[PDB]
Amino acid sequence: NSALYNVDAGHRAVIFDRFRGVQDIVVGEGTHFLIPWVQKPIIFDCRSRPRNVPVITGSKDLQNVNITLRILFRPVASQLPRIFTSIGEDYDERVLPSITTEILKSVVARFDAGELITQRELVSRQVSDDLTERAATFGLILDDVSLTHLTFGKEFTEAVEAKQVAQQEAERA
């Protein structure tokens, strides 16, 4: 039973041989056979894992945005042993923070809140492409990249509400 292991659905296993080191292939789902006490497996998730990355980001107009990005990412099946050796099972908390923060900050520094909201497609495409490019090096596919939680400072909210109140004051007056 010690050498009898099984990997659940939507998951992959990376096997390490003590006498030969890490593997160069990844086995599929379901129970499999291995040499006791020499071939130790590690189970990784192939199902799309969601993650939210709330952050305050400084736009070029020096008005920070409290912005949350939701990304459905799963590791590349082929390169699972590579990432495991490079960083280990703590591959998200050791990589995702830095890449997410730098990508979002670089995207935001291009424009300001007005330019952020006026063109959602531009920022969405920018973040998606940049994150995919960054994760290509780290070999973690992004099942879905989506930004869905926007919040600004009270000053820009004051500006928008001033615009709207003047517009309504037109009709009221």
């Binding site: 659905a9 789902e29 379901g30 199902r47 909201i117 959602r120 989506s146 869905t148 919040t151 709207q164």
Partner: protein, 118 residues
């Protein structure tokens, strides 16, 4: 007596049982409809998916073309497609609603309502 008990199972109420084979994992293309079926005691351990369409209410502030936040809560009634029961599981798990609907619905709302004013 327990050999037969664990060997054959009945699926009811618009539910689908997909067998998790031990040969290679999920038994793809072995999907079955309601009724009675033979489940292997060990190799095949079925997972039951409720076909019955379920609703979900999503509440989330969304920006508009007027740059104002609107909390336009939306209710969606959805069910899994009967023709792709295994693969979705293989890529989603047994909890796909909370894993898919939030992202897609919130992104769609932000990209649709943002183009219009109040």
């Amino acid at each position: 007596a327990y050999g037969v008990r664990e060997s054959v199972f009945t699926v009811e109420g618009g539910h689908r049982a997909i067998f998790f084979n031990r040969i290679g994992g999920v038994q793809q293309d072995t999907i079955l409809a309601e009724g009675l079926h033979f489940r292997i005691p060990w190799f095949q351990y079925p997972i039951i998916y409720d076909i019955r369409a379920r609703p979900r209410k999503i509440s989330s502030p969304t920006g508009s073309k007027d740059l104002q936040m609107v909390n336009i809560s939306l209710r969606v009634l959805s069910r899994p497609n009967a023709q792709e029961l295994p693969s979705m599981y293989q890529r989603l798990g047994l909890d796909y609603e909370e894993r898919v609907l939030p992202s897609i619905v919130n992104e769609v709302l932000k990209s649709v309502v943002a183009k219009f004013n109040a």
